[model samples]
Each structure stands twice: as C-alpha cells, then as structure tokens.
Target: RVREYSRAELVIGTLCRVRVYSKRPAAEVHAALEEVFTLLQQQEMVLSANRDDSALAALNAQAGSAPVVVDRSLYALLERALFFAEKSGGAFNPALGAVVKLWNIGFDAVPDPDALKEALTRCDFRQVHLRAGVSVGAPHTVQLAQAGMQLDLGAIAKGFLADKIVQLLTAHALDSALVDLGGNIFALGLKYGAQRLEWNVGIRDPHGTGQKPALVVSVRDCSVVTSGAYERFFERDGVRYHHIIDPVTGFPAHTDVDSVSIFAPRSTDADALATACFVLGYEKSCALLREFPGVDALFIFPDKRVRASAGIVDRVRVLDARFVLER
Candidate 1:
C-alpha cells in the first residue's frame, strides 16, 4: 500500500534530484518519472540560452521596441514575478537581471561601471509592454542586452518543475508523492496510515565544506528551502561577494542573516521567498511574512543565531541543539 521513488542527477548545472512516494508499482512510477524528466529537459531548453535553447529566433533580442509575440510560459512567469516584486515591496524583482550580470562577481569578473549602468537601463520590465502573449518596447539602443542581463531562474525553476511533475503524476492515478527538486522539497503523503507525511531534509553546514550537515528539518506536506551566502561567492579586496543581488542597490544585499530557511505551502513560493528573505534579513522579513498569510520564514545570521516567525518551529522541527532556533 506504500512505495517511495527517488531519482538524482546533474541537471540544469547542479546536483538535481527527485523522490516521489506513491502506492503505484515501481515500474509504472519509473515510467512516469522518465516522462517528467523529458518534460524538464524541454522546459530547460525553452528558458536557457545554452546549446539547446529554443527561444524564438526572430523575437530573441533583435525585435527591439517592436511588438513581438512570446510563448505563454515565459510571459506568465515574467508577469507573475513582476507582480510579486511589488507584493514583496521590491524584495523580489525580475527587473534586476542587469545587476546580476554587472557585478557578475562570483559568476564573472566585475564589469566597468558604465557598462553595468547601460545594462540596467534596458532591464526594467515595467518599460516592457506585454499584452496578449506579446512583448514590446524593449530598448533599441541597448547593446549586448542579453549578454549583460541573464535571467537566472535557478531560484524558481526547480520548484516549478517539481509542481509540474506532481501535476503529471496525478494524471497517472498517482495521488500522493514526495518530489524533492534538489533543495526544494514537497512531502505529499505519508507512507503509513495515521502517520503524518514529513521529510527530514538535512541542511548543509555552510561553514564546513558540505561534509558536516548543519541540521535536519521535519515538516509535513510543506516546503523547506535555504538560500545561503556561502553557496556562490567571490572574495575581492578582503570582501565576499555572492549571487543574491539586491534589486534596489544593484548589488548583493547587506544583511545579518548568512542564510535563510523559508517554510511555505507551495515550493514556488518557498523558492522565491527564500531568496527574498535572505536579502531582507531577519526583523524586516519576519514582519513582511506576518502580513502575508500562509507564509513563514526563519533567518540564520552570521553570529550563528537562528530566528523564526510565530509558531514556525512548531510547524518545522529543527535538529541540532547547538544551533539555537529562536522565534
């Protein structure tokens, strides 16, 4: 009456994995997983500029200031992200792609200031006109706009794909499953009757070289995602620079929280919220989560102290006693 299915690999340039628990035969579930994997590959090509990128050849970058039709998926994500940027009061903005490439920091060497600003001017989504599956009014004079501004969807792609897998599984008569898209996890149903479905996912010790796990979390049918400064960074002139770029300052956010663990009902929200909270830090992020229903977060500062919103620890069981989890 119970089964657990899990898969892992290097996907989208990372150690990606997916574990699904269902009451179906292993072969049947395996077949479904293969289908989902194909779907994931297809989605990756659509979004990525890699060798297989499938963006419209004509509408890709050269359209400039003229209305050009766009695919539904790309437009929907851009629209939703822009709306959420305002919802989070700018903590999350899709328009900051320019800054990501400017500071390139860990990803690429820092570019000259003038070149960075030029990319920023062409990056705003507000100036982009979108109507009925089309985009228009992108700056014409902007050179290498795509080169300087890459929309890094590493934050949201996994969770979105996990949700997509679940939808496909449901069609195959698989009602309950656990799909962990790398760090992004969703515990769908319990393996045993009367027992709550929870996942004890481990958080890597950022201070260590990933050998020592910092902690294990217990949560039921919810998402647990961590965005740590240690993941990707560069040391320059005795300063550390990382991947999380502040949309307002066009640079990495200055915050006490070295890492953030966000608990949410949906993986997509958890993915984006983790990045947002890491930038906003503890006090302000907690206040922001309180205003938004069904969202809770915890912040771990550089001082090695942990803090969470009201009843967050009750919902999330954090192991490792030395790591103090404050509410």
Candidate 2:
C-alpha cells in the first residue's frame, strides 16, 4: 500500500507544502521532502526582490552603474520573463519592481502622485539588458539601463520553484507527488492507489472568506495557478487597490476580472499567464491565449460569472451553486 509523506515550511513569504505518495520507506520520502524545502529557501535567496541581500536585489542596487553577473540559470529565467513581458504587451512585466515598491499595497499607505509618476518611468521591461559572456566559459550578466529601476520576480518565481520541486521529486523516482508553492500548484503523476485516479484541484473562491472552493478541476501531471485581485489589496478613499499593478498606468489594474486561473504543462507559464489574463480581462485575454495553443484559462468576473477556455471546459466542475459557468 502507498503511504503519503508530507512536509510544510514557511518560505518565500508563504507556507509551502510538498507531498509524496509512494511505497518507499517513510525515511526515504521524508529525506526527499527535506531536500525540496531546502531548495525553496535557496531559490528564495536568489530570486527575492524584497530582501536586500538577494541576487536580484543586488542587481537592482547596481542599476545604471555596472552589469551584475548572475548564475546562468537566473540569466535564463530573466530571458523567459522578458519573453512573457513582450508577448503579453507588458501586462506581465518583471521590471515593475519600482512601481510595486511605490504602492506597497498591503503594508504601506498610498504613495505620492509625483513619486508614482517617477516610478512609472522606470517600469519598462525593454530597459532590462541581458548579456552573454564574451568568452565561451564566462558568466552571464544583467543590467538595468536606468537608475532606481528594480526587478521583481514575484509574479512568476513560485511557479518556477514549483517546477524545480517536481524535478527533484522525479529524481527520487516517486509515483505521485504534489507541490504547492503558495498558490502555484503542480500535481505530478496519477493519484496513489490500485485504481490510479487523477488529482482534483480546487479553485479558491475570490469572494469566499474560508477554505471552501468555488470550482474544482481534475488533472494529472499538470499545473494550476491563480491570480486574484482579492489576494492582496487595500482600501483607500472608498476604492480598493490590489497588488497587481499595470505597468502602463502606474496603478492597480482596473479590470473587471476578479481572478483568473491558468492551466498549462509548465507552472512558470501558468503563473505568468494567470497575472497576464487577469490584467487583460476576458476578451483580450482570449486573444492572447491564441498565441499559446495548449494553455487554457478560467476567468471569474465581479458579477460571479465564470468563463473558461474551450480546452479546459470539459475538465472543470462547478462546486458552488451560485457561480454561473459560461461556455
């Protein structure tokens, strides 16, 4: 009989959990879980923008001065980030660190208008420069062309980390595993048992105050990531401002979408697409999904109306009676 082994830790500013279902000895499975948690902490040191000592923070500190050499993997991650930024028409930008700091949505008060305008000028992803090493065996480097510019990987970092955890679990030769890096989740392999079933992942209700989900999707060996305006926000002057800021507007995204969930083979893409789709809303998001053929999206609007991409419609089941799932 397969036994489940799990571990949870506070890392990357969220409670991350990793679970494995295998016939392997409990000690072996726990060893793997320990490694995964360590990996999360290591990646956080490299990717966190809020930490002053993180690699990305060091790069931001040197903005407009000199190119900062980073690990080869990080350089490639930056390339992927820029690809999404350009493809989404800046809807999912990594260079919005300055704007994110300016608003500080959850922790601080509203920022000055002039300060926000100044921050907006530095929010262009095109200004982020990446250069390969001059020699064959040299290091990769990244630089921000303008001063006061920063790089925030908050939107996609957890997804990338989740993918890494999956790789670790696969290396352990596990039959089934689940990785939850905050809300970026991956269900690997079939469910553990004689009957081999798919995992059922719940989509959290944007309006709900508790753990009850509004929708559920059955899947195996895939990722499901949600970006919700309700996740983090502050009320000011009778208006609510969320943490997801628009690069062009230098303010919170003014979108009718309350949340968007993306389903894809790669957690990294799903995470970035979730934010991009939420910002793009239903119509334009549909147009964007055409560029990514295999990816599917589910959008929840403020009026409790739900719409999903054609590819995921059959996979989803509505759990809440009040939600109207549009075809």
TM-score per prediction, in order, is 0.84, 0.96
Clashing pairs in 1: none
Best candidate (score: lDDT):
2
Cα deviation of 312, candidate 2, in Å: 1.5
lDDT of 2 by residue, 243-297 (tens): 8887777778888888899999999999998998888888899999999998888
Q: Flag regions of model 2 displaced more than 4 Å.
A: none
Residue 75 alpha-carbon offset, candidate 2, angstroms: 1.1
The per-model lDDT (C-alpha) reads 0.65, 0.88
Identify the runs in model 1 with alpha carbons over 4 angstroms from their true place.
49-52, 56-63, 105-108, 133-152, 192-196
Q: Tens digits of per-residue lDDT for model 1 on 223-291? A: 778888888888777888788877666667788787887777777778777888778877778777776
Error of 2 at 264 (Å): 0.7
